[PDB]
Amino acid sequence: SRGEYVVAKLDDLINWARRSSLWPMTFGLACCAVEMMHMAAPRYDMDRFGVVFRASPRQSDVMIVAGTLTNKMAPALRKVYDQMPEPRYVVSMGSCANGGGYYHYSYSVVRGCDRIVPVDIYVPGCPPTAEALLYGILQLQKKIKREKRLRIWYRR
Amino acid sequence: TSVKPIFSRDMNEAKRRVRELYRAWYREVPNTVHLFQLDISVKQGRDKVREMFKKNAHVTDPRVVDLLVIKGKMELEETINVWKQRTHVMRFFHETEAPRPKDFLSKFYVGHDP
Amino acid sequence: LHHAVIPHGKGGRSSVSGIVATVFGATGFLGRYLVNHLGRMGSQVIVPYRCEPYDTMHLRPMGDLGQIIFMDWNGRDKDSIRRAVEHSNVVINLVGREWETKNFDFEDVFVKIPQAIAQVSKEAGVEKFIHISHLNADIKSSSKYLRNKAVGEKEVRETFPEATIIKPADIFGREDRFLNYFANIRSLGKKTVKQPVYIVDVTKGIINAIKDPDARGKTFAFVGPNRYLLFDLVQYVFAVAHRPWTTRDKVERIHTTDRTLPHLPGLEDLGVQATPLELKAIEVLRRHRT
Amino acid sequence: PLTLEGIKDRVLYVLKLYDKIDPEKLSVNSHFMKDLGLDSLDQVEIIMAMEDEFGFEIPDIDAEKLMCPQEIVDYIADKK
Amino acid sequence: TRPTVRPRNDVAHKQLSAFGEYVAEILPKYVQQVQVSCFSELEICIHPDGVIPVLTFLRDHSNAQFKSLADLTAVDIPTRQNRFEIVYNLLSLRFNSRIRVKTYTDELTPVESSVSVYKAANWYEREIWDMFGVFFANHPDLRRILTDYGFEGHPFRKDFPLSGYVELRYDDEVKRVVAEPVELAQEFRKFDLNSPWEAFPAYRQPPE
Ligand SMILES: NC(=O)C1=CN([C@@H]2O[C@H](COP(=O)(O)OP(=O)(O)OC[C@H]3O[C@@H](n4cnc5c(N)ncnc54)[C@H](OP(=O)(O)O)[C@@H]3O)[C@@H](O)[C@H]2O)C=CC1
Ligand code: SF4
C-alpha cells in the first residue's frame, strides 16, 4: 500500500517533469512551417511553456510533422524519426499532414502521415491557427498527465 | 516516311549499346550491395537484373531500344552515385507479396479479374 | 452470415478480407509480426492490452484507417475478455511471460489464462481458435516452463476441444530473444541439437491455417530446416558477430533438450515454403562494432 | 612462361567455375552459342569474366565476334 | 460594351500584325503560322528543325531583342500525329512584347537543346524530359527532377492516370518503407459537367 503510494507520487513527478517543457524539432515542409514560426511569435509564445524550437534531433522531445509529405520525403522522414530518444510523441499539424488534404487524390503525395509514423495529436486546419495548435499542445500535455507508466510497471 | 533516328543505324548498334549497358550493370552490382548494407545475395540481384533485361525482349524499333539504353544509363548513374537510398533498391525487388497466381481456380476464389 | 464479411475485390490496405481476428498479447514480438501480416492482408484486428498506450501506439500505424482497435483486459477477470470476444470471427491465444514475477509466477498464467479465454470463447461460439505453445513441451523433468505448457495444451484439448494447438521451435527475427541472448554474453560447452526456424514463414503459416479450413483440431509444429549443432550455432553467431533476465531457468531452456516429432505436420505440409538461417541471419547480424 | 595452354587451362577452370551451364562439355570445338546453347547474355557475362580475370579493356565489338573458346584464347594471345 | 468590358489596344494589334508578317516574310524556311490573338499577344507556330536557328535569330538581330525566357511547356494533345507542343515564351526588354513560339513535336523524334542559346532553358528542359519524354539530344544533363528516382512513367501525360500506380507505406516485417499497388480508400468521384448547347458560336469547328 505504501509502496503503491510511493510509486504513484514518483510516477506523477516524472510525468510532470516530462510534460513540463517538451521542446520539439520543427520539421516543417510547407506553409504549416510558416504557421509554426507564427506560433513562435511574440503574440503566442512557445517559450512560456518550456517549448523551444530546436533542430537538434537527438534532444527532440516530441516531433511536429507539418506540411505535405511526399514520396521523396518519406524515407528521410522516418530516418529522422528513428534517431530520436525513446519517449517520443507526434503532433500532426495541418490538413496535408493528417490525411493528405487537398493533394489527396494525387501521386507523389503520401496519404497523410499515418503511413509512416505513429501519430498522437491531430490538429486540423489549413493552416491550423496558432491558437488551435497551442490548444493541441495543451491537450498533448494532458495526455502526458494520463499515462500511469510506473504504476503499470509496479503491477507488472 | 523519313523519320529521324536517335543514335544507331539498326538493331545491331542497339545490341552493342545494350550489351555495354549490361556489362556496366553487371560490374556495378557488388559496389552497390557492399555500400547500401543490403539484405540479398549478389547472384540473386544479378539474376533479377538480367531478368529485367529479358523482360523487354520483343522490341524492334531502334529508337525505342536506344531510349531504353538511355533510361538504363540514367538509372545506372544514379545508382553509382549515392543519390538513391535503401528504399529504392528494395523497391526494384518485389518481396511484398501479393502472391496472386494465374491459376484459374485461385483466380476464381478471389475473382472479378479478366 | 451478414454481408461485409465476405472478401472484397483484391487484398490488402482496405481491400477488405474475410476474418475478424481477436488477438491476445500482441505487444510481444510474434504477435507484432502477426498484426503486421494481418494489416498487410487488411483484415480487422481487435487487440486488447494492459500496458501503457505507448507500445500499442507504436504498433498502431501498421494497421490501416481504423482497421485495428485497442481495448483493455486484466489478468484475472473473465468479463473484459468476454467483452473483447463479443463479436469475434477468429481468436488467437498468444500470451506468456518467460519468467516468474511477484504477482504472476508460471502458475495460473499458462494454467488459468487459456482455460478462462477458451471457456468464454466456447461460450461466445468462435471458430478456428489458435493457441500457441512451444515445441517439446512435455510432462517430464527439469522444465517448469514446458510442463506448464503441456498442462496448458491438455487444457486446450480438454475444454474447447475444437481448437488448434500449435507449436514452433526456437524462432528468430529482428527482435529475437535468443539471438540477443547469445550476443549479450560476458557460456558452457555441452552436447545439444537444436533447430531454429525463421519467423515470417511461421506467421504466414499461422495466417494460412486461420484462414483455411480442414486444419481445425489438428496440432501443428514448426521445424528448422537444417537441425544442426548447438556448438556450431554458437560458433557461427560468434564468427558472424565478428568479436573473436538471465535466470537458471532460461539457460536450462536453451541448453537442455530439443528433438523432432513425426506425429504432426511441419511447414510444407501446410503449404508454406520454409527458409533457412543463413540469409536472414546475415541480415539481422548487424551491430558488430563502430 | 606465358604459355598458350596454361592460359587455356585457366580459361577452362573459370568455365568450370561458371554455374549456369551444366555439364562442363567443353572443347575448342565448342562454339557455345547454340552448339552448347548459351544466350548472348551469358556470352557477354563470360566475356567480361575473362576481361576481369586476366584481360585488357576488351571492347565489345571484337569481343562479340569471338563466339568460340579457342578463338577467345587466341584473341588473348593476339592482344596480350 | 462601354462598362464592364476589357478594352483592347488596336495599336498593338496592328503593330504585332506588321511585326509577325515581317518575321514570316524574312524566314520562309520554318514559319508556318503567325497568329494574333484577340487579346494581342503574338503566336508563331514553328516546325521543329529551326529551333536553334530561330532562337539565335530571336535572341539577337537587334530589331527584336527578346532576352527574357519564359516557359517551355509541352501540352499533351492526342488525336495528332505529332502530339506534344514545345512552347517557348519570349519577352523583349527594350520593347515590352510577348511572343509564344509554339514548335511542335512527336513522341520520339527529338528537338535540339535550347541551353546552347538560352541558359534559363536548362532546368526547364530537364523537367519537361522527366514529365513527358520529349527527348533532348545535344544536351549535357537529362536527369530526373520533380519525381522519385524509383518512380517512372512520365506522369504528366494524359495517358497516365490521376492516382499513380505505386503507394508507399511502412512495415516492420522488412523494417522499411515499401511500395505497394494503389489502394484508394475513396473513389475520387469524377463529375461529368460539360453541358451541351454551344456556349460560343464563333468557335464552331466545321463538321465532316
Ligand atoms: N523462445 C521464444 O521466445 C518462443 C516463445 N514462444 C511463445 O511465444 C510467446 C512469447 O513471445 P514473445 O513476443 O517473444 O514474448 P512476450 O513475452 O513479449 O509475449 C507475451 C505478451 O503477452 C503479455 N503477457 C504475458 N503474460 C501476461 C500476463 N500475465 N498479463 C498480461 N499480459 C501478459 C506480454 O506483456 P504485456 O502484458 O506488457 O503485453 C507480451 O505482450 C510465449 O507465449 C511463448 O510460449 C514460442 C516459441 C518460441
Ligand atoms: S494544411 Fe494548408 S497551410 Fe498546411 S501545409 Fe497543407 S496547404 Fe499549407
Domain locations in chain A as residue ranges: 2-156
Cα–Cα distance, D14 to D49 (Å, whole number) = 8
**C53: preceding bond cis by omega (within 30 degrees):** no
The cell for C272 is 508454406
Pair E44, E63: CB distance under 8 Å? no
The cell for E42 is 503574338
Question: Between D40-54 and D69-79, two packed helices, what is the crossing angle to 10 degrees?
Answer: 40
Angle at C269 between CA C264 and CA C271, to 5 degrees: 140
Write the DSSP assignment of C137-197 as a string of letters. --SSSS-HHHHHHHHHHHHHHHSS-SSEEEE--EEE-TT-SHHHHHHS--------EE-EE
- CATH number (3.30.750.24, 3.30.70.520, 3.40.50.12280, 3.40.50.2300) of A2-156 reads 3.40.50.12280
Residue D37 lies in a domain: yes
Nearest alpha carbon to residue E128 among E75, E175, E180: E75
Cα–Cα distance, C271 to C205 (Å, whole number) = 8
B29: left (phi over 0), alpha (psi -120 to 50) or beta: alpha
The SS3 call for residue C276 is: coil
Nearest alpha carbon to residue B44 among D60, C226, D19: D19
Ligand 2 pocket: which of A29, A73, A95 to mutate (most atoms within 8 A of CB): A95
Q: How was this structure determined?
A: cryo-EM
Pair E85, E75: CB distance under 8 Å? yes
Grid cell 554474453 is found at: C185
The SS3 call for residue B53 is: helix
Which one of the ligands is nearest to C52 CA?
1
For chain E, where are the alpha helices, taking DSSP H only? 10-26, 51-59, 121-131
The cell for E180 is 505497394
Distance set, CA A114 to CA C25, C58, C64, E124, E193 (Å): 23, 11, 8, 34, 34
Pair C177, C139: CB distance under 8 Å? no
Pair C48, C24: CB distance under 8 Å? yes
Classify each residue of A122-138 as buried b or exposed e, where b means 16 or more C-beta atoms within 10 Å of its C-beta.
bbbbebbebebbbebbe
Single-letter amino acid, residue C68 = I
Q: E170: part of which helix (H) or strand (E)?
A: strand E166-171
The cell for A141 is 500535455
Cα–Cα distance, A143 to E36 (Å, whole number) = 66
Cα–Cα distance, E159 to E153 (Å, whole number) = 10
Q: Do chains A and D touch (3 or more CB pairs under 8 A)?
A: no
Number of Cβ within 10 Å of residue C154's Cβ equals 12
Residues 6+ apart with CB under 8 A from A137: A22, A49, A51, A91, A121
Pair C117, C152: CB distance under 8 Å? no
Closest residue in C to B44 (Cα) is: C279
Cα–Cα distance, C106 to C103 (Å, whole number) = 10
Cα–Cα distance, C17 to C13 (Å, whole number) = 10
Classify each residue of C258-268 as buried b or exposed e, where b means 16 or more C-beta atoms within 10 Å of its C-beta.
beeeeeebbbe
The SS3 call for residue B71 is: helix
Domain locations in chain C as residue ranges: 1-290
Cα–Cα distance, E180 to E166 (Å, whole number) = 6
Residues 6+ apart with CB under 8 A from E147: A72, A108, E130, E131, E155
Which chains are within 8 Å of D by 3+ CB pairs? B
Residue D1 lies in a domain: no
The cell for D3 is 604459355
CA B60 vs. chain centroid, Å, equals 18
Residues 6+ apart with CB under 8 A from C78: C116, C119, C120
Pair A90, A117: CB distance under 8 Å? yes
Instruction: For chain D, report the end-to-end CA distance as a whole number of angstroms.
Output: 13
**B98: preceding bond cis by omega (within 30 degrees):** yes
Provide the shortest C-alpha distance from residue A48 to chain E (in Å): 36
The cell for B70 is 538511355
C160: left (phi over 0), alpha (psi -120 to 50) or beta: left
Ligand 1 nearest-atom number relative to CA C170: 48
The cell for E68 is 527574357
A7: left (phi over 0), alpha (psi -120 to 50) or beta: alpha
Neighbour order of strands in the sheet with E85-91? E31-36, E42-46, E98-104, E85-91, E68-70
- CATH number of D15's domain: 1.10.1200.10
Number of Cβ within 10 Å of residue E33's Cβ equals 11
For E35-162, where are the alpha helices, taking DSSP H only? 51-59, 121-131
Cα–Cα distance, C167 to D34 (Å, whole number) = 52
Ligand 1 pocket: which of C101, C104, C134 to mutate (most atoms within 8 A of CB): C134
CA C105 vs. chain centroid, Å, equals 20
DSSP bridge pairs for C98: none
For E45-183, where are the alpha helices, taking DSSP H only? 51-59, 121-131
Pair A92, A121: CB distance under 8 Å? yes
* DSSP strand pairing (C196-198 vs C164-167): unpaired
Pair D61, B17: CB distance under 8 Å? no
Classify each residue of C49-88 as buried b or exposed e, where b means 16 or more C-beta atoms within 10 Å of its C-beta.
beebbeebbbbbbbbbeebbebeebeeeeeeebbebbeeb
- Ligand 2 surroundings by CB, under 6 angstroms: A 30-32, 67-68, 94-96, 101, 126-127
Single-letter amino acid, residue C181 = Y
Pair C54, C25: CB distance under 8 Å? no
Identify the DSSP state of B14: H
Grid cell 469475434 is found at: C88
Classify each residue of C230-254 as buried b or exposed e, where b means 16 or more C-beta atoms within 10 Å of its C-beta.
beebbebbeeebeeeeeeebbeebb
Cα–Cα distance, D30 to D69 (Å, whole number) = 7
Torsion sign (Cα): D64, D65, D69, D75: negative
Write the DSSP assignment of A32-64 as a string of letters. HHHHHHHTSSTTS-SGGGT------GGG-SEEE
Residues 6+ apart with CB under 8 A from C186: none
Cα–Cα distance, C93 to C132 (Å, whole number) = 6
Residues of A in contact with B78 (CB under 8 A): none
Number of Cβ within 10 Å of residue E150's Cβ equals 21
Q: Do chains A and E touch (3 or more CB pairs under 8 A)?
A: yes
Nearest alpha carbon to residue D12 among D1, D22, D26: D26
Cα–Cα distance, E129 to E120 (Å, whole number) = 15
The cell for C22 is 481477436
Which one of the ligands is nearest to C258 CA?
1
Print the domain residue range for D70. 6-80
Cα–Cα distance, D65 to D71 (Å, whole number) = 9
DSSP bridge pairs for C221: C167
The cell for D20 is 549456369
Cα–Cα distance, E125 to C96 (Å, whole number) = 62
CA E62 vs. chain centroid, Å, equals 26
Any D CB within 8 A of B54 CB: yes
Please tell me chain B's helix, strand, coil percentages from 3-state DSSP, rounded to the nearest 5. 60, 0, 40
CA dihedral D69, D71, D72, D73 (to 10 degrees): 90
Classify each residue of E110-131 as buried b or exposed e, where b means 16 or more C-beta atoms within 10 Å of its C-beta.
bbebbbebbeebeebbbbbbbb
Identify the DSSP state of D17: H
Cα–Cα distance, A16 to A12 (Å, whole number) = 6
Cα–Cα distance, E27 to E35 (Å, whole number) = 16
Nearest alpha carbon to residue E129 among E91, E84, E165, E69: E84
Pair E181, C11: CB distance under 8 Å? no
Instruction: For chain B, report the end-to-end CA distance as a whole number of angstroms.
Output: 38
Phi, psi dihedrals of residue D10, rounded to the nearest 5°: -70, -35
Classify each residue of C109-144 as buried b or exposed e, where b means 16 or more C-beta atoms within 10 Å of its C-beta.
bbeebbbbbbbbbeebebebbbbbbbbbbeeeeebb
Cα–Cα distance, C181 to E53 (Å, whole number) = 74
Cα–Cα distance, C74 to C80 (Å, whole number) = 7
The SS3 call for residue E177 is: strand
Provide the shortest C-alpha distance from residue B111 to chain C (in Å): 7
Residues 6+ apart with CB under 8 A from C230: C190, C191, C192, C193, C194, C255
Please tell me chain A's helix, strand, coil percentages from 3-state DSSP, rounded to the nearest 5. 40, 10, 50
Among the partner residues B63, B87, B92, nearest to E108 by beta-carbon distance: B63
* DSSP strand pairing (C130-132 vs C90-93): parallel
Cα–Cα distance, A96 to A103 (Å, whole number) = 7
Cα–Cα distance, E153 to E130 (Å, whole number) = 9
B12 exposure class (CB count in 10 Å sphere: 0-12, 13-18, 19+): exposed
Cα–Cα distance, C202 to C196 (Å, whole number) = 11
Grid cell 562442363 is found at: D24
Classify each residue of B17-40 as buried b or exposed e, where b means 16 or more C-beta atoms within 10 Å of its C-beta.
bbbebbbebbeeeeebbeebebbb
